């Protein structure tokens, strides 16, 4: 019933997700293959890709490049919060052909 005013989106069951709050600003940022339809809070992000891909490759790509995509937008102030939206959003990764997925 709470989706009347959850301010959330129900997402599909083959997704990835990533935190933007308070483990990074210090350390490694986690991520996980979420295998069920679900929702998350204010304090992290859900990502589905679009069809030109294989989704596990995106997961391993992000978990590989985590240690420098945290470096790209690390500080964002001395506040308790962490990485900006835009510089997180505006990173380029090498996306190959399907046989190299």
């Amino acid at each position: 019933e709470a989706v009347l005013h959850s301010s959330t989106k129900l997402i599909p069951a083959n997704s990835i997700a990533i935190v933007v709050r308070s483990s990074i600003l210090d350390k490694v940022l986690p991520s996980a293959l979420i295998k069920v339809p679900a929702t998350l809070n204010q304090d992290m992000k859900a990502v589905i890709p679009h069809e030109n891909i294989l989704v596990k490759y995106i997961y391993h790509m992000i978990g590989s490049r985590g240690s420098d995509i945290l470096r790209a937008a690390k500080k964002t102030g001395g506040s308790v919060a962490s990485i900006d939206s835009k510089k997180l959003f505006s990173f380029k990764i090498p996306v190959p052909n399907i046989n190299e997925q």
Partner: protein
């Protein structure tokens, strides 16, 4: 701590016997009266010295310390004479005692101050016994060349338990107000709090540098009172040396005296004020060059604008902030834009958390100048300073010495911050300060050295599993 730390503990013993602020007012008034009495006796009898004095009546001679120190104590109402007749009924003559130095109308009064020691108190004999016990306990403080007020610094630091400074950070920002400028004056302070950060330079430069006394402004009433007695304890000249009461956002004074030459401050954080704003304070002399005000949740940079208003043609400035005021929406962004409009903002230096009294956040200091080269230089600093147990650190005189060495001539030292460009900061959205720390300890390894080790792990592992299978005989 040699012969000191025992007396620090004696002050801790004297800290009885109720909630701290109430008796603390009487404690500060007692030591204040004792110090004024001893300084006045030291002036009038440096050579025949008399414990008990006389009614010598010579007013013409009396008015000359009333021009010099501005206050006759009295003929016989000094402390050392009053210390003879202790426990004597009654005690309220001290009120009349505060009538004596408060005459002081000639010249430039600096009086109207000592209204702290009121009366509560429930009976007159309670008042007599309590105040006489306080005077007896403060008389036994064996202090007497005559360093006195550091125990006062302890007792004023013993509260909010406000937040003033861990005093080596004040010595640091004093060394930021350096260098080499025997140039009137020093030092103005908006929201001074105590006179602790308003002390270090001229106390170190008693006749090294010779400019003028100190000016400032502070919000609270009782903080204003303890600030005036704080600055009065440290044997500082009467000359113009004062702070006026008020708020810089509401009563900015003094404009006419003068464009200052050096300023330090500790502005409090998140200090939301009247919005946004109902008077014409956009169109004042200092916020109209910015372009927009400083609203409620972002009420910080009004202090730094008020700071940069009162500045000379050459003399530098140094203020403290916390790095959370980073971009803070477009209003603070355009405030930062007018700050980076020139080399107004010269350097910024971060300082590791906490190094304070349970705040627990990091801070940074902004050093400003109309003395340009010019490029921006974000020499921020992380670790190391110890922080929590005793003070801590506090703090590593060689470390601040070498950071002054870095501040001297613009080095580019990795594993530490370095210079940037104006092109870099317009490439930023005026950020404070992500650039330019580099080190991350991401250390390489070797494929083969790791994998043959893992093979050794397996050659241990499988035979130990075999021996467990041997041990499965039950």
């Amino acid at each position: 701590a040699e012969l000191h730390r025992q007396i620090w503990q004696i002050a801790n013993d004297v800290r009885g016997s109720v909630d701290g602020w109430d008796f603390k007012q009487y404690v500060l008034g007692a030591l204040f009266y004792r110090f004024i009495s001893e300084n006045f006796s030291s002036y009038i009898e440096a050579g025949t010295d008399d414990i008990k004095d006389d009614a010598i009546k010579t007013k013409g001679y009396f008015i000359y310390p009333s021009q010099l120190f501005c206050n006759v104590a009295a003929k016989a109402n000094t402390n050392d004479r009053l210390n003879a007749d202790l426990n004597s009924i009654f005690v309220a003559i001290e009120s009349s005692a505060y009538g004596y130095p408060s005459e002081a109308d000639i010249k430039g009064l600096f009086a109207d101050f000592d209204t702290t020691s009121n009366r509560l108190g429930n009976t007159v004999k309670d008042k007599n016994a309590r105040l006489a016990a306080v005077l007896k306990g403060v008389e036994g403080l064996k202090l007497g060349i005559d360093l006195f007020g550091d125990a006062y610094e302890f007792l004023i630091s013993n509260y909010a338990a406000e937040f003033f400074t861990p005093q080596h950070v004040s010595k640091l920002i004093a060394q930021l107000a350096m260098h080499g400028q025997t140039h009137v004056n020093k030092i103005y302070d908006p929201a001074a709090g105590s006179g602790s950060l308003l002390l270090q330079a001229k106390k170190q430069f008693d006749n090294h540098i010779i400019e003028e006394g100190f000016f400032g402004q502070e919000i609270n009433h009782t903080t204003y009172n303890l600030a005036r007695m704080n600055m009065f304890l440290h044997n500082i000249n009467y000359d113009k040396f004062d702070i006026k009461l008020g708020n810089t956002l509401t009563e900015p004074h003094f404009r006419d005296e003068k464009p200052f030459d050096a300023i330090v401050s500790n502005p409090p954080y998140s200090v939301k004020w009247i919005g946004s704003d109902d008077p014409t304070l956009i169109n004042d002399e200092r916020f109209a060059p910015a372009g927009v005000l400083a609203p409620k949740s972002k009420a910080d940079f009004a202090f730094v604008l008020h700071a940069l208003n009162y500045l000379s043609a050459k003399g530098r400035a140094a203020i403290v902030c916390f790095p959370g005021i980073f971009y803070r929406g477009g209003a603070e962004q355009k405030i930062r834009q007018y700050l980076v409009d020139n080399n107004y903002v010269e350097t910024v230096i971060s300082l590791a958390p906490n190094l304070f009294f349970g705040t627990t956040i990091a801070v940074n200091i902004l050093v400003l100048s109309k003395h340009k080269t010019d490029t921006n230089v974000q020499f921020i600093d992380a670790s190391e300073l110890f922080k929590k147990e005793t003070n801590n650190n506090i703090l590593t005189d060689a470390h601040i010495e070498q950071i002054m060495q870095v501040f001297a001539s613009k080095e580019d030292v990795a594993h530490l911050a370095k210079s940037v460009a104006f092109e870099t900061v317009v490439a930023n959205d005026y950020n404070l300060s992500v650039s330019s720390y580099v080190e991350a300890k991401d250390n390489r390894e070797i494929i083969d050295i790791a994998e043959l080790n893992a093979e050794l792990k397996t050659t241990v592992s499988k035979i130990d599993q075999l021996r467990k299978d041997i041990d499965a005989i039950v």
